[PDB]
Amino acid sequence: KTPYEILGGEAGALAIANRFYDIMATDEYAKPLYDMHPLPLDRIRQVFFEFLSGWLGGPDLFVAKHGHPMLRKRHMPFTIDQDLRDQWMYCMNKTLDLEVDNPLLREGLKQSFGQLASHMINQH
């Protein structure tokens, strides 16, 4: 069974994407990460969801509409240090605790996001 399947499919991917930004947008420690996002969040909420649907084994909605992830490259316009990586993970940890009831999948998702996040870092 895929992460997409275990999390309830579309509604599960949507809820993660939305909870992530919901928390990012109000939590103090992540203001800096939040401030890199020009408002409103409508499009990035939708795009991140599209990404999650395929990264979890549902429809590649991202690769259908925007092409391959190339996430490291796609983040190269921004300055991303350790500090911002940790802010991003802090938000996604909090999200996955609330959204993923399977504790194995949850720890699996945290580690795999944790790695992707570290991969984006481009300032040391």
75 labeled binding residue: yes
Cβ-in-10-Å burial (0-12, 13-18, 19+) of 106 comes to: middle
Closest C-alpha to 87, from 113, 105, 49 = 113
CB-nearer residue toward ligand HEM: 31 or 37: 37
By CB under 6 A, tell whether 23 contacts ligand HEM. no
Q: Which of 114, 73, 69, 59 is nearest to 90 (CA)?
A: 114
Q: How far is the CB of 44 from ligand HEM (least distance, A)?
A: 4
Dig out the tokens for 22 from the structure: 């919901």
Choose, by CB under 6 A, the member of 31, 78, 101, 122 that binds ligand HEM.
Answer: 78
Residue from 51, 56, 96, 109 touching ligand HEM (CB under 6 A): that is 51
124 is in an annotated binding site: no
For residue 78, CA distances in Å to 64, 66, 72, 85 come to: 24, 19, 10, 12
Q: Is residue 75 near ligand HEM by the rule CB under 6 A?
A: yes
Annotated binding site for heme b: 74-75
Contact residues for ligand HEM (CB under 6 A)? Answer: 33, 36-38, 44, 47-48, 51, 66, 71, 74-75, 78, 80, 84-85, 88, 113, 116-117, 120
